[PDB]
Design a binder for this molecule. Sequence first.
Ligand SMILES: Nc1ncnc2c1ncn2[C@@H]1O[C@H](COP(=O)(O)OP(=O)(O)O)[C@@H](O)[C@H]1O
Lengths: 50, 400, 450, 223
Amino acid sequence: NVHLAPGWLMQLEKKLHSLQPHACFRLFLTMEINPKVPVNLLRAGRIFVF
Amino acid sequence: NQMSTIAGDCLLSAAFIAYAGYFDQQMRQNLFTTWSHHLQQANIQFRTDIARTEYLSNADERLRWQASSLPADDLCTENAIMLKRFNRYPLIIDPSGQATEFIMNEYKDRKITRTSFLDDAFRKNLESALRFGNPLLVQDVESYDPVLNPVLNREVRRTGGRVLITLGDQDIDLSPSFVIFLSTRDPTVEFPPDLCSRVTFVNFTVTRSSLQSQCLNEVLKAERPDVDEKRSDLLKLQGEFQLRLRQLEKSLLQALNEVKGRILDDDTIITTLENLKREAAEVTRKVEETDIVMQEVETVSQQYLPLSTACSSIYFTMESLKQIHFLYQYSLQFFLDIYHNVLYENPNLKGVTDHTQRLSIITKDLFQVAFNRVARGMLHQDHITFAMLLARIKLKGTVG
Amino acid sequence: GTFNRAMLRLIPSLRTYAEPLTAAMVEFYTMSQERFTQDTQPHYIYSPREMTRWVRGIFEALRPLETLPVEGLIRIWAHEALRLFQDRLVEDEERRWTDENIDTVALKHFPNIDREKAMSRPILYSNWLSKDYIPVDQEELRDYVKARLKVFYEEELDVPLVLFNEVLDHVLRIDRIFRQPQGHLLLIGVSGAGKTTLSRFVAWMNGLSVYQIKVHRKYTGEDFDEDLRTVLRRSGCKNEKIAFIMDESNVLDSGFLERMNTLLANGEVPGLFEGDEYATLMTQCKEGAQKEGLMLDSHEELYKWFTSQVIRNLHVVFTMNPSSEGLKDRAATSPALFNRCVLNWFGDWSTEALYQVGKEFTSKMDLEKPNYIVPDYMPVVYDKLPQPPSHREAIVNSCVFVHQTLHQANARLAKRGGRTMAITPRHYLDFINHYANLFHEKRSELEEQQ
Amino acid sequence: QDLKGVWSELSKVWEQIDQMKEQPWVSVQPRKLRQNLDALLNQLKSFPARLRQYASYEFVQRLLKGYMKINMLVIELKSEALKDRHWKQLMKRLHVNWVVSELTLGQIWDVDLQKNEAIVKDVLLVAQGEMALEEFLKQIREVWNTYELDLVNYQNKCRLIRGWDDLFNKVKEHINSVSAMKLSPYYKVFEEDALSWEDKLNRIMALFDVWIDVQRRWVYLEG
Ligand SMILES: Nc1ncnc2c1ncn2[C@@H]1O[C@H](COP(=O)(O)OP(=O)(O)O)[C@@H](O)[C@H]1O
């Protein structure tokens, strides 16, 4: 339900960009299609429409 | 002979550095051709094959830039060159965001800090940077704060033993190590003429011609390594190979002076003179075999031109998909990952050695992979639309 | 006609010329009004106000001069006509039309005069080379302004300035506006053309101190009021002339313009000095009046004296970029900018200006080439280029062509609708500096290799 | 005969140059030096063409030319930003015995500033950076030795502290400024004073962070 937190989504994207995960880290953002989602977050993720 | 042409070469290079920063790659090339045509028509001597990226920078700096996460593209190398030889503080327009990371990595040894005009603490960060010396990268120049006008104008007054710069109402000092890079993540934006005059724009946006050239270079590197090596040897033919020859001459001079009459005692220096002779003969052979290699790499590039055009068309279709639905925001990095999967890690390409057949397989798999990656993140009603767009792209690409 | 018959009484030799003079003035005013309207440009307004200034300018020129020939009177008439009508013009075609029509009207209404002596191309007047407002040769003016530029560099601020004919004329225009009560000046031109530097230089000549506010984010109207209070105090109470210089950066805020408009119009702004500020203003104003030689005790009379001093001592200089659409906005939010401020337009850096700037800046560079052979046809972009040109001239011509190529490329991109970035003379100076640095560096590298 | 005449003519110029070079460096005014050098060049340009052909005349003319060229270097060296440590560094780099009371234009002019210009420019950039940091430190000292707590009466019970936002903003600004100065390349000289002022500012911040809470709770509980 990450769409419930629009600004926190942008903050999460900012944290993700300046970071070096482990070779198997995988962040999943289950979400509902909504215009509230940041454009940068959409650009920085592998979208899966369900 | 080089003395006979240095004036025109420097004229063209300085014009390219000063102007031609904001323009895309095609407009930069058009302007450079216009200036070269004028200089030729005015009987001003200039080198006919001036490569800007290797006349304004050398191999050590380019290797450092690549190590600092600068994409290996002609446009990006030219932009990095303009970011090095700048008289006015540059303004970086990078929607992708790679150039900010490039600057961060390049000046990390100088303790560069990142700030934005939107942040209210921008004034204090700028004051500290100016007063102490660490470089500053200011972001979001669309909201440019006019306190930076004296900084951009270099209005420094030296009273007593202080080099002051009146930042707003204050009179803070200036440190010699200070340097500021404005930045923008928005390509489409209008700037005031004063701001345009006080900064040198460094445009990092990817256009149709830019992406076509980048993809052509990548396919040439991946599928025709010999052609890519011959193309790079043409570029290394000016500057780099000559510098290697001068380094060999310096080594010979150092070794020759070292012998205390051992020029005949050991009879081993002749190995060094023959090695230098062979290397110089290699350089001369490559220099004389320049037109042939030019035409050869031109034909080989023409082989993959439809593939590069298809790549550019596919990426800009992906970009324009944002109008269909708000979820359809795809990045240049996304398309480049698709292209990496198409070129390398391709199961269909295994066991295939014919170059034309490999090109056909790559061209087919490009569309296949593009659809498989995009349509997964699309509503089922848009699958047919995207397939139709890709079909139109393929129909444009095919011959016959 | 009555104003002229009054003004020509200073020189008894010309009394029969009052009617031809007023006929020519009215005729040229009518043709200028018809040809240039508000449709083409926002500031192309012409009114009897222009003709009154014309009469006042001719009267001021004639006031100290003991006697003039008819050709000298026509020269003064033409110079004031230019300074009133040609100065505001934007397009070189309009400037050429006005310049031609001035000679046409002068010759039509004044026969039996020498055209060469009455009107010449470098028609310039200045009081720097003599006690009076007599015409000065442009070479002598160039030498004088070069010397004063050297002095201004040693003193005040060091702002290098190439002295071509356009800048030489703009200096005279700014001086003419400055030596005038309530002589607020409005300079419109592209950034980097030297609007602020020229105003500072002329203000340094005339003894005017220069006050520029440092606009920024969070620069509140209260801060603007404080700056206005300081400049008004210095100008009125202390009888210190101030050349207030405001760019379009700090004109952007709407709250600033109202106060600036009121100050331009009335010489004073109401509500700026109130309470303790008004008490202190009166305290210092009484001392200033006593120092000047006036004994005023009533607060209203003291404030009237303060307003008169601000009128006679403050010269606001406005500079903005040549944005006609943005210039329309300034007219709506500030009619003083168009009624009191004398608009000046020198946005374009001509090809001659570019050539001179390139030639002076590319003088340390070793561009001489004895074996350089001039082509049969050369793409001459600077029409006054000496021929057969040398390598220096060819290089500077190529630099001028590079700047013009940038202009053409930006024009084409604007035609296609794409985003276009302004090409300012700051770009040209940057290009020349890059050329100098890169030429020196590469020559050093090649000499070291040799 | 011509050599004797040119020597006699050049004797006045050489005596003037010696008078210049004997000036104490403290009293040397570089602008007046520039004006007098221009006057000397003008005087030399009036020499007869028969004397101008000799090599000594050209040598003296080129000497005056380079003498004018390094006048900018004299402007920069005369700046008060230069300290005893920087003068000692110049000693070490130029291998000279310049005594502080015995600095003279003759010494700085015997040393070839036309050849060690890179070294002098480096030391002057260092001096500018150090002066910027030291003047920041002086500004901090002045601000925090002038600052006073704004006390206002509270219901005639006591004088409570006001301007909490301004005081905390100043403390945060100075703490961040010191932290950013630790990143400066000229930080190592002022490391001790920077540490002392960081300690002072941190103590102030902790003290007033506790104080604002104490005052707020006491006001509420009194009410
Ligand atoms: N004709 C010129 N010769 C030399 N420098 C010039 C000339 N015109 C402009 N400049 C340069 O312009 C800069 C000052 O710009 P400024 O006059 O403040 O701009 P603006 O006209 O936009 O207010 C200086 O670097 C100055 O050398």
